[PDB]
């Protein structure tokens, strides 16, 4: 069964990880990316997944 579902997300300081309404911790800063030193942010994930 394919499921697409919209959820809320909550991160506390230092914001190097967050949660979801279902209760799943995503181990990556909500601001990690590619633009303007965003690769400085934290992601314990293999860079190919993002």
């Amino acid at each position: 069964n394919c499921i697409v579902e919209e959820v809320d997300a909550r991160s506390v300081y230092p914001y190097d990880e967050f949660v979801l309404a279902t209760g799943d911790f995503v181990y990556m800063s909500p601001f990690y990316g590619y633009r303007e030193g965003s690769h400085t942010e934290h992601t314990s994930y293999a860079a190919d997944r993002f």
Partner: protein, 50 residues
């Protein structure tokens, strides 16, 4: 010397500073619970990456 005056002594009420006081801080209240659900979740969701 004798005096026809009647004495009266008035001293101003001195200043007094009120320092902030708390019986319990909210961190102690958060620690009152035997199991903080969030911290348990964050620890237990690191098993594969650990």
């Amino acid at each position: 010397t004798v005096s026809t005056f009647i004495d009266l002594n008035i001293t101003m009420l001195e200043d007094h500073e009120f320092v902030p006081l708390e019986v319990y801080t909210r961190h102690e209240i958060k620690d009152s619970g035997l199991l903080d659900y969030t911290e348990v979740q964050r620890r237990n969701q690191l098993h594969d990456l650990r």
